[PDB]
C-alpha cells in the first residue's frame, strides 16, 4: 500500500569507461524528478543516493521504472550519450547502463 | 488533448453541431434516464420508509 | 391526449387512399385491434391472431370468430336461432 | 481434464490400476504477496481423463510424493 | 471448384497427364513426321469445359 519502492541503477560500465559521472547524473535526477507535477512536493518522499557506482532511488509516492527510463534517456540525450549507452533492465527495478 | 478540450466544454457550439438534437443525444434516452432516476429515488424512499405506499404510488404516477 | 382530430389509427396511412376508404379501414382497424372480454375468465385479454382467430392469453384459449370482431352480429343471430330451434325440438 | 481436491480420492485414482503415469508439476503461486508458495499439481493420466490433484502445502506434497508407489511412472517438472 | 467429385478429379488428372510436350526420341524414330504435341493445352488458352 504505502510501502516504499526501491529502484537501482548500475552505472559501473559507463563509470569505468569514464564518459559519464554518477554525481551529475543523480543531481539531474534530483532537480528534474517532479512529484505532483510541480516543485516543493519533493519533501523527502522521493530520495536519490549515490555510492559512486550505483544510484539508488527510494519512492513512497508515485514513481515508475518507465519514468526513470524516460528521465535517464532525457539526460543521455542532453549530454549526447545516446548511441553509446543503453538503459537495460536486468530484473524488476534493477536497471543498468550498457555500452556494447 | 481534443477530448480534454471537449470535457472542459470547447468545440461544442452551433458551428460545431452538424447533427440534429435527437441525432446527437436522443430525447428518448434522456427521458429514460430521467424516469429511471425518479423511479429509483421513489423506490428508495418507499423502502426506507420516508413515504408510505400510497404517496409512493401517487408520486409514481406523477413521475 | 388527442393528437389527431379524425384520422385516429389511420394516421399511419397519412394522406393516400382517399378519405372514405381510410374511414372504413379506420372503423374495421379499431374493431380488429380492440381488446375484448373473455367469456370464460372475464378478463380483457382476448387479442386477434388472424381473421377468425381470437386468443385469450391469460387463460390460454383460442376462439373462432369474425375477421375483425370476436363475435359478429350474424354469429349472434345464428346462435339465438339455433338455441331457439334446439329448445323447440327438446320441448 | 478433471479437478481433484481430495487426497484419498487421488489415492483411489492411483489405485485404479488403469492409470500408469503421473506428472508432478511445480508452480510458484501467490495467495498473499508475502507468502510465495510452491503449488504442486499431480496430473494422473487415465485412459479417458487427466485428473489434476491440486495442493498448496509443501509438506503435504512431500508426504504424498513419498507415499506414491515407485512402480508408477512419475515425471517431475 | 474446391468441392469436386471423383469423376471431375479423374478428368483433371487425365488432362494434367496429357498436358506435356512430346518426348524427343519419338522425333528420332525413323519414318516419323511428328515434331510437336499438336494437342497441347493451356488453362488460359483452351478450356476443356467439363
Amino acid at each position: 500500500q504505502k510501502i516504499a519502492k526501491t529502484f537501482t541503477v548500475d552505472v559501473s560500465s559507463p563509470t569505468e569507461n569514464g564518459v559519464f559521472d554518477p554525481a551529475s547524473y543523480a543531481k539531474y535526477l534530483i532537480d528534474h524528478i517532479k512529484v505532483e507535477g510541480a516543485v516543493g512536493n519533493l519533501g523527502n518522499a522521493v530520495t536519490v543516493t549515490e555510492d559512486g557506482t550505483v544510484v539508488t532511488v527510494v519512492s513512497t509516492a508515485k514513481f515508475s521504472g518507465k519514468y526513470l527510463k524516460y528521465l535517464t534517456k532525457k539526460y543521455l540525450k542532453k549530454n549526447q550519450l545516446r548511441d553509446w549507452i543503453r538503459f537495460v533492465s536486468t530484473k524488476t527495478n534493477e536497471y543498468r547502463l550498457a555500452f556494447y | 488533448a481534443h477530448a480534454q478540450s471537449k470535457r472542459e466544454g470547447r468545440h461544442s457550439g452551433y458551428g460545431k453541431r452538424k447533427g440534429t438534437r435527437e441525432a446527437r443525444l436522443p430525447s428518448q434516452v434522456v427521458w429514460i434516464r430521467r424516469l429511471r432516476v425518479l423511479r429509483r429515488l421513489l423506490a428508495k424512499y418507499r423502502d426506507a420508509g420516508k413515504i408510505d405506499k400510497h404517496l409512493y404510488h401517487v408520486l409514481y404516477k406523477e413521475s | 391526449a388527442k393528437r389527431t382530430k379524425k384520422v385516429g389509427i389511420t394516421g399511419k396511412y397519412g394522406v393516400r387512399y382517399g378519405s372514405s376508404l381510410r374511414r372504413q379501414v379506420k372503423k374495421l382497424e379499431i374493431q380488429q385491434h380492440a381488446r375484448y372480454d373473455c367469456s370464460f375468465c372475464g378478463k380483457k385479454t382476448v387479442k386477434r391472431g388472424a381473421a377468425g382467430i381470437w386468443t385469450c392469453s391469460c387463460c390460454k384459449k383460442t376462439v373462432a370468430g369474425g375477421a375483425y370482431t370476436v363475435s359478429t352480429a350474424a354469429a349472434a343471430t345464428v346462435r339465438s336461432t339455433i338455441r331457439r330451434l334446439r329448445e323447440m325440438v327438446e320441448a | 481434464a478433471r479437478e481433484i481436491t481430495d487426497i484419498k480420492q487421488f489415492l483411489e485414482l492411483t489405485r485404479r490400476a488403469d492409470v500408469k503415469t503421473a506428472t508432478v508439476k511445480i508452480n510458484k503461486k501467490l495467495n498473499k504477496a508475502g507468502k510465495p508458495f510452491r503449488q504442486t499439481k499431480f496430473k494422473v493420466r487415465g485412459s479417458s481423463s487427466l485428473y489434476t490433484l491440486v495442493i498448496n502445502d509443501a509438506g503435504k506434497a512431500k508426504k504424498l510424493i513419498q507415499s506414491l508407489p515407485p512402480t508408477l511412472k512419475v515425471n517431475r517438472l | 471448384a474446391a468441392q469436386k467429385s471423383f469423376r471431375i478429379k479423374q478428368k483433371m488428372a487425365k488432362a494434367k497427364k496429357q498436358n506435356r510436350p512430346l518426348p524427343q526420341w519419338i522425333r528420332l524414330r525413323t519414318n516419323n513426321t511428328i515434331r510437336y504435341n499438336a494437342k497441347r493445352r493451356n488453362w488460359r488458352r483452351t478450356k476443356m469445359n467439363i
Binding site: - | - | 370464460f40 388472424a50 381473421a51 377468425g52 382467430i53 384459449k61 383460442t62 376462439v63 373462432a64 370468430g65 369474425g66 375477421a67 363475435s71 359478429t72 354469429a75 345464428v78 346462435r79 339455433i82 330451434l85 334446439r86 325440438v89 | - | -
Partner: protein, 50 residues
C-alpha cells in the same frame, strides 16, 4: 390462403386404441378444448355435425 380458421379436432377410433385427428372448418364461437359431437343422434349445438 383461406379466410376462415381451421380446427384441429381429435376423436377416439372406435375399432382400435388410437386417436384420430380431423381438420374441420371452424364455426364462429367454437373454442379450444371443446366437446363437439358428430352423428345422427347429436344435439343441435354450434359445432356439431348433425
Amino acid at each position: 390462403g383461406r379466410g376462415a380458421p381451421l380446427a384441429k379436432v381429435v376423436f377416439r377410433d372406435p375399432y382400435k386404441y388410437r386417436l384420430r385427428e380431423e381438420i374441420f372448418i371452424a364455426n364462429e364461437g367454437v373454442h379450444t378444448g371443446q366437446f363437439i359431437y358428430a352423428g345422427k343422434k347429436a344435439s343441435l349445438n354450434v359445432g356439431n355435425v348433425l
